[PDB]
Amino acid sequence: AGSRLASGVIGIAQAGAGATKAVAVLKGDGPVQGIINFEQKESNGPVKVWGSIKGLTEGLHGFHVHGAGGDLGNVTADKDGVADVSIEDSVISLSGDHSIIGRTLVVHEKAGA
Numbered sequence: 001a002g003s004r005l006a007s008g009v010i011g012i013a014q015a016g017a018g019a020t021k022a023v024a025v026l027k028g029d030g031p032v033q034g035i036i037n038f039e040q041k042e043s044n045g046p047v048k049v050w051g052s053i054k055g056l057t058e059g060l061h062g063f064h065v066h067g068a069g070g071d072l073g074n075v076t077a078d079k080d081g082v083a084d085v086s087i088e089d090s091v092i093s094l095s096g097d098h099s100i101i102g103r104t105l106v107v108h109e110k111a112g113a
Contacts, residue, residue, distance in 0.1 A: 004109040006032040006053070010065070010100055018042045020094040024105040031055030032109055036085060043095040049087040053107060056081050060112030065092065066104045075107065 006028020013021040019041050026034040034053030040046070049072060053061075056077035063075045069091050077083040092100050 004029055005106045006034070006109055007066075007104050007106040008036075009104055010038065010102065012101055013037075020101075022094055022101055026053060026105060026107060028055075028107070028109055031081070032107075034083075034107070036105060038092075038094060038100070040094045044093065046088050046090045047092050047094060047100075049085060049089060049092075051085050053077070053083045053085065054081060056083055056107070056109065057111040061110075062106075062108035064106060065100050066106055067098075067100070069098055070100065070103070074112070077111075 006026050008024040008026040010022050010024045013023050022038040024036045032055040036051040039048045058077050058079050060074040064071045072087055075083040075085050094101055
């Protein structure tokens with residue numbers, strides 16, 4: 001039994017004079033679905049990750065971008081199976097050589113734990 005993932009590619013939403021936005025539509029097995037937004041005002045600036053994921057078993061779930069420097073820790077799903085996400089991370093970026101744009105966001109469907 002290898003780990004089942006819900007995942008989605010991180011796509012560009014907007015550009016500005018430095019400001020970037022991106023979205024990942026997460027899709028997995030059964031009812032697992034979510035939308036995760038990413039925002040950065042300036043290059044090399046902190047990245048605000050926010051959104052929510054539904055259909056997850058209650059508990060912790062591995063949550064990260066597939067690739068180097070892509071660990072965002074875990075998200076916590078409540079008894080409804082809903083995990084609200086709200087992280088600010090300066091490791092990841094939406095520009096440069098390690099831009100998470102075009103890379104795949106994944107969440108472990110197996111709880112924590």
